[PDB]
Design a binder for this molecule. Sequence first.
Ligand SMILES: *[C@@H]1O[C@H](CO)[C@@H](O)[C@H](O)[C@H]1NC(C)=O
Ligand SMILES: *[C@@H]1O[C@H](CO)[C@@H](O)[C@H](O)[C@H]1NC(C)=O
Ligand SMILES: *[C@@H]1O[C@H](CO)[C@@H](O)[C@H](O)[C@H]1NC(C)=O
Ligand SMILES: *[C@@H]1O[C@H](CO)[C@@H](O)[C@H](O)[C@H]1NC(C)=O
Ligand SMILES: *[C@@H]1O[C@H](CO)[C@@H](O)[C@H](O)[C@H]1NC(C)=O
Ligand SMILES: *[C@@H]1O[C@H](CO)[C@@H](O)[C@H](O)[C@H]1NC(C)=O
Ligand SMILES: *[C@@H]1O[C@H](CO)[C@@H](O)[C@H](O)[C@H]1NC(C)=O
Ligand SMILES: *[C@@H]1O[C@H](CO)[C@@H](O)[C@H](O)[C@H]1NC(C)=O
Ligand SMILES: *[C@@H]1O[C@H](CO)[C@@H](O)[C@H](O)[C@H]1NC(C)=O
Lengths: 163, 163, 163, 314, 314, 314
Amino acid sequence: AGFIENGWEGLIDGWYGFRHQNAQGEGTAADYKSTQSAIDQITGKLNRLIEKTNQQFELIDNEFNEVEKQIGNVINWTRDSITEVWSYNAELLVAMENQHTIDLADSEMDKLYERVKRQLRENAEEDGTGCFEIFHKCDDDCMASIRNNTYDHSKYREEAMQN
Amino acid sequence: AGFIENGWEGLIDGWYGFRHQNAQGEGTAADYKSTQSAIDQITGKLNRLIEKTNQQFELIDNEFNEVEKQIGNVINWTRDSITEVWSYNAELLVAMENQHTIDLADSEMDKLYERVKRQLRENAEEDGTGCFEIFHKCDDDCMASIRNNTYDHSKYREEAMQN
Amino acid sequence: AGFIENGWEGLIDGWYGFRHQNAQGEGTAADYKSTQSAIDQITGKLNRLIEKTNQQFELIDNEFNEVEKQIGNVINWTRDSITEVWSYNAELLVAMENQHTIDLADSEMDKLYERVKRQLRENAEEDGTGCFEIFHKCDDDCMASIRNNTYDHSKYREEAMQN
Amino acid sequence: ICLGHHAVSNGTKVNTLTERGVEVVNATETVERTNIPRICSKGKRTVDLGQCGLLGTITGPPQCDQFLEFSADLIIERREGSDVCYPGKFVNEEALRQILRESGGIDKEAMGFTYSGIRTNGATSSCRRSGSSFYAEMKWLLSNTDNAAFPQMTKSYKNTRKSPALIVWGIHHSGSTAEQTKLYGSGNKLVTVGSSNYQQSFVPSPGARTQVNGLSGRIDFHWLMLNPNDTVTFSFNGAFIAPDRASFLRGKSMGIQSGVQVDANCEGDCYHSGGTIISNLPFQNIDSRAVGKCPRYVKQRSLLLATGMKNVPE
Amino acid sequence: ICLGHHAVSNGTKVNTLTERGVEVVNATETVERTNIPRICSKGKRTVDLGQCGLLGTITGPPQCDQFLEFSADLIIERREGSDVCYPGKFVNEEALRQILRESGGIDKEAMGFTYSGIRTNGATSSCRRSGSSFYAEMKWLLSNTDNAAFPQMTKSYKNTRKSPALIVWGIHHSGSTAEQTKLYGSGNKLVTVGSSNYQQSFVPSPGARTQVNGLSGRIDFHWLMLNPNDTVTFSFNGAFIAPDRASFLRGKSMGIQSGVQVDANCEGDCYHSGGTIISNLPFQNIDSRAVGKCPRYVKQRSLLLATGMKNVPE
Amino acid sequence: ICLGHHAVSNGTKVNTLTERGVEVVNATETVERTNIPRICSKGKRTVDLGQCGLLGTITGPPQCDQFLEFSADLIIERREGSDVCYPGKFVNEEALRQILRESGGIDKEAMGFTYSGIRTNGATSSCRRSGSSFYAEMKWLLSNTDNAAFPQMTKSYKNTRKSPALIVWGIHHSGSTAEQTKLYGSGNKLVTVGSSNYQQSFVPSPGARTQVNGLSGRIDFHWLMLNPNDTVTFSFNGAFIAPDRASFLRGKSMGIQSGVQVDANCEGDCYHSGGTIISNLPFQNIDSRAVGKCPRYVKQRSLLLATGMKNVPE
Ligand SMILES: *[C@@H]1O[C@H](CO)[C@@H](O)[C@H](O)[C@H]1NC(C)=O
Ligand SMILES: *[C@@H]1O[C@H](CO)[C@@H](O)[C@H](O)[C@H]1NC(C)=O
Ligand SMILES: *[C@@H]1O[C@H](CO)[C@@H](O)[C@H](O)[C@H]1NC(C)=O
Ligand SMILES: *[C@@H]1O[C@H](CO)[C@@H](O)[C@H](O)[C@H]1NC(C)=O
Ligand SMILES: *[C@@H]1O[C@H](CO)[C@@H](O)[C@H](O)[C@H]1NC(C)=O
Ligand SMILES: *[C@@H]1O[C@H](CO)[C@@H](O)[C@H](O)[C@H]1NC(C)=O
Ligand SMILES: *[C@@H]1O[C@H](CO)[C@@H](O)[C@H](O)[C@H]1NC(C)=O
Ligand SMILES: *[C@@H]1O[C@H](CO)[C@@H](O)[C@H](O)[C@H]1NC(C)=O
Ligand SMILES: *[C@@H]1O[C@H](CO)[C@@H](O)[C@H](O)[C@H]1NC(C)=O
């Protein structure tokens, strides 16, 4: 989400995808692998945080008949201290998990971009805004081979090389 | 801060910058965008940590007339436990925040380097030590266009390509 | 550990290394720098976590002659609360440290790959699976110069360039 | 061919380590706030004490007649409950309450106390049953006639079980010295209770108190836990409410204080006075004094966890 | 054209998860250590008790004559303060102290106790005012002449307000039995105090103690919180320090123990015995028993937070 | 030329923030579970009380005769230890125990109490030495002959040191009123103890108790800490166990309860009833009530820390 200026509101099929415009027409598709990886890691993070505590705490005060004032002030003091501890732990936990989540999604996008660059060696150039400027008409079946990770790195080499 | 051997002590205008030497002369400038982003994130981290607690804790012991020894030992025991908890939380908090800060600055530098490589496609090469070996005399106004992110990727293409 | 399909079980000399096959024969070697950096950071993490607490806690209960039931239930209540706090802190600590460790190793591998690409500018290509497809017979002494970071970027330039 | 990510029109603002208000795609809640205003007791043996007080289940006032040998996994106290019919007070109230909340119920058994030359059926107007009665588990020890003396008696009981027993006796503080002499006789009275862990020292104190239920006298209940095979002894010369039956804890249970209804249609392990907290979230902002297996209470009303990528719209 | 980052000659060493001593550019402190040796009470109603003890404000020794109806947001106790003029001691000291620290002040009102046939003005040398006086809020109940008897009296007071009242009475323990008979008369004395939540049982104990202020007698002060519309009752036959006026809590306040000066030029919400902690940092290493709205105390003297990039000099 | 990383055949599964069971190369343990079933006391002055109870070291029963002036850095209590020879009980037991555990030992010194007209050597069968003896640090104060009266005496002691003193006296509760009159005389008995911080009020209570060691009487031990230069006073007319010598704390020590053997071959700073925890790990799962310098107890049995890269085999 850096050098890519903004996200695609029309992309409702997944989290990441390809938007191609050649000589045949326009199209948008979703990359199942990176999206499923991201939602798998975030889903596992949720499942790790959505934990049920198996520790039982009994009643230590009394709402109907107040306990003695000294031991009651000690109980309230300890309970307030623990409350501060858990408020801090919750704040820091949520903040850190959100940071690692956002940077995780950015890492997934960056790795998808890097591998798409790994497929197209010298047959295409980079523009700087997350696009791959092609120098050989790539047919819709050729771009479908790009999405399927089956693009031959050398059967379009010289053609897109002399341009 | 990896393959870049060391920092520039003379760079007093910002955190990141360009040091160019062509055919016209020498010069150093600062990149306002990446530096302002880094100091914005670190500044926001400070503002997130420099928080004032709105929870009031009352006096539970007595310095002039010591309370009973049993309840006093319980109070000291609980207070020492909470003290250990907050010492641990402070140590871990500072350590993690420092780690994420350093790696954040390294990420900002790496992204600046990556985008400067995104501007210069085939008109220049990479040396390995954070420099861009140019193969066309680039004028001082051309390097000023590099810093302003206005370098035309194709109006110097063949000239720096046949070298 | 991403676009590299799997690890090398035969690599028993270090954590990262080079496996080269040219015209002379086969071979595997270990990169001392990246491995020593990784084990230095992880070792320092262990030394930071393997800390001895200098805080002494005295006996507050009594196993042979049970204390009064009210103050005993308060003591058990506080001790159980602190136990929950330290269980949570231990779980989160171990999880976060493991995450940062794995991503740290992945970062070291990625930086080694990136610097090996920094050595070989236009004299070789990238395949996409963590290999460097050479286009000039590189002798075993040439690959030993690659591992020693002494490969001349231009004395094999045109030869591997016209291929 | 270009690459990109998905976005939405209206995102969800979350907080991170660096900024506060970063708009992402999807985010879930981690702090529970929804509360069910009922006591979810599905699949649990539940005893709603109602007008009966917890401690009363050991002494047995009229309102506790149907709770003398209860058994439950969850015990519910009500603010209208009362431990006493005759005006009085327990010593170490909350200790015995906390003991009885996790007892799993009580099991009474006659201690076998026979008396010779002493009237044993003392009653009062405030302990109404068919007429004037007393605690169903206690014996108000008085003199034979409207006066005469009280013999300095001693009675012992050996815990013949494998679990500790709950021993509860009473010390009657009359409305005046003349009434103490009328019920037991003149002279200083003493009640001694002894065992291996207990060793205590009672003496009545007659006087005038506020008219609770139209009465000025008081009765102070005391208790001790008797270890197996160990004997408890009493040496008293008057002003004594003797125990008829001893109590034995059945097992484990849960004790809560609430004012909402019981509902066997929902199940929950986190209770407070306003209901049940049924949630999988790790935190809650309902009641700090919630008991059971609860999410840990925090002060924040909400803490949004980012479940999606950062939202960057056009 | 080359790219690079900034550096400095002398960096700041910080600690991370991987190493200890990583030199970075800039770093700030997170553990507070600077302490102001004053009580910053700017904009707060402050009462410096000084030589007056906190509990004394309810009984009223001479040194507390100007604190009988104080009102404050911050209460400061001094180690030279004393609760008593006549040598004595409060029962449940720290409980009543903790109650009075957050009370926002006290509000006295005469309880309306009239006596018939009993001398009401007992004084002592240690409670000096114009001559020999006593507690300004208490009445030392004695016999009419140098002897005769003490009638077994009973007096009641109904809390006619909406907030609980603070009831404090006294039990005089004379220097000898002959002096107890000289002040009240022979025979066993009893003081009974009763209400809906209270039910207690006093009896004097004459004897010789250490000469504090040149005196061997003692006075034990007791207290209870009376709920609205509920009545407190006393049945006593001698050795009684009766309450003249009852106390009512004004609101909320803060109570600290300190030995430094009051300074209305600075504002602070974190106090300890050595002064005020005015800091925005999340942690502090001054006093673990600091009270108010304080940074959380840690054991580490310093914890440097990295605010800049790693420093790599040439 | 290709690049790659190392792997293994059988990795170690660890848990992270995203998944649970990620197989890595190497992983170490962070939760300690190995326990040494001994008391590692290498280089520490150790006192194994054995059959002697801790509190007994102040009163001095026979089994504590060799512990009257002990000195240690580590104190070990045994479940077979006993504080008393004559059947009795301390008031504020665990407070005095916690005081004596960190005292570094005790130092006795004769208080200098001389008596005139009162028999001072009272003994019992259960306190066996050469014949019938008593507490080595106490004096059972009785009447001259088998009856007569007990003069109302008063004795004082001034703490002439720089550290607080431990003052322990006794209140004898006889088996019957006739035995109390036989040992001290008829009439109400009182024992008054006074100082600057103490002010208390004892009175015996004769009666029958359970036959512990074949005896029905009891002795209640009481204590107070006397500040330097401050005087403690006693005014008693019978039923008094007087202190012979006062105790002074030596310094600092550690007190544990254990049932395992002492071993001077290993060193450890974390102790529990089952032994010593010698570990560098930050957490432990042995005993939650472990004392000393211990790893912090957690509920998890194991928590594997990843020390290597993720393991991806072919
Ligand atoms: C503890 O706090 C509660 C409020 O949650 C309050 O009702 C109670 O009175 C406090 N305890 C004491 C002893 O004041
Ligand atoms: C608690 O610790 C303080 C030192 O901060 C000490 O003065 C006090 O005596 C301790 N409490 C008891 C009951 O010993
Ligand atoms: C506290 O827990 C222990 C078990 O570790 C138990 O033996 C003890 O009885 C509990 N305390 C009370 C007062 O029940
Ligand atoms: C968004 O998060 C909520 C949290 O429970 C989840 O139920 C929902 O399915 C999520 N939606 C998407 C599109 O991820
Ligand atoms: C209890 O006493 C009986 C008979 O005196 C004996 O058979 C039994 O073993 C004893 N049990 C224990 C636990 O002491
Ligand atoms: C360094 O950090 C301190 C922390 O308060 C700040 O005041 C100062 O402005 C910072 N300086 C730079 C150059 O970042
Ligand atoms: C208190 O009593 C008065 C008169 O007896 C009555 O008017 C008032 O409603 C009562 N208030 C409460 C809270 O009981
Ligand atoms: C694996 O970790 C353990 C942890 O103590 C260590 O002793 C061992 O040397 C490590 N081995 C390798 C190959 O890293
Ligand atoms: C204790 O008293 C002695 C003599 O009365 C005196 O010399 C000494 O200074 C006093 N010490 C203290 C601490 O009061």
